[PDB]
Amino acid sequence: MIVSFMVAMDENRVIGKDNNLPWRLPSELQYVKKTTMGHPLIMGRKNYEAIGRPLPGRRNIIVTRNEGYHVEGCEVAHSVEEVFELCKNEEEIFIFGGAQIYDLFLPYVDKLYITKIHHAFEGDTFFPEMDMTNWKEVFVEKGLTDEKNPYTYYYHVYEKQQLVPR
Numbered sequence: 001m002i003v004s005f006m007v008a009m010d011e012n013r014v015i016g017k018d019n020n021l022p023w024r025l026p027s028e029l030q031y032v033k034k035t036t037m038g039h040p041l042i043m044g045r046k047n048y049e050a051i052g053r054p055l056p057g058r059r060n061i062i063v064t065r066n067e068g069y070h071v072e073g074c075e076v077a078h079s080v081e082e083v084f085e086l087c088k089n090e091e092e093i094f095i096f097g098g099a100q101i102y103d104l105f106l107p108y109v110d111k112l113y114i115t116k117i118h119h120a121f122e123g124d125t126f127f128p129e130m131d132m133t134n135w136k137e138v139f140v141e142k143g144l145t146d147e148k149n150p151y152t153y154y155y156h157v158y159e160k161q162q163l164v165p166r
């Protein structure tokens with residue numbers, strides 16, 4: 001299965017403030033919806049609670065250590081192992097964040113969908129550093145900037161650099 005990171009972050013890798021997005025870009029979220037259609041969304045509990053509702057049309061899988069945690073319309077996993085078990089047959093899954101959730105799936109990640117917002121916000125949580133020399137850009141696109149989407153931002157997609165033998 002393809003393990004994909006789905007992330008939107010600013011110039012300093014901010015991905016959150018107080019728990020919410022420091023920015024409001026409806027068009028970005030529509031890109032998320034289009035891209036993840038028919039694939040599982042994997043997210044930490046805090047991240048899911050910040051969004052408020054199950055995102056329709058996808059397996060919403062919430063990752064928490066809490067064995068008692070349950071929520072309507074969502075599945076719950078308590079470890080990476082359980083997530084991979086649950087997505088046994090999936091073609092591609094999207095790690096939807098929680099800085100800590102990205103860290104858990106780092107050893108397995110195959111594809112990066114990264115929205116880079118060209119602005120510096122106030123934030124308290126960050127997309128962990130990554131050595132991008134292992135990664136190759138396969139797609140880029142300038143996001144729609146307008147009245148409802150004030151900032152400038154870009155969709156980037158990365159796959160693994162293949163490496164030429166000695």
Ligand SMILES: CCC[C@H]1c2ccccc2C=NN1C(=O)/C=C/c1cc(Cc2cnc(N)nc2N)cc(OC)c1OC
Binds near residue numbers: 020
């Ligand atoms: C309204 C239409 C889209 C709707 C939706 C409906 C169905 C299926 C998927 C989605 C996508 N999200 N949708 C939302 O309202 C909320 C998205 C959201 C997300 C993220 C994470 C995220 C944000 N962005 C990126 N690129 N990576 C990401 N990992 C964080 C949020 O608050 C912290 C969110 O809520 C503001």
Ligand SMILES: [Ca+2]
Binds near residue numbers: 109110
């Ligand atoms: Ca892998």
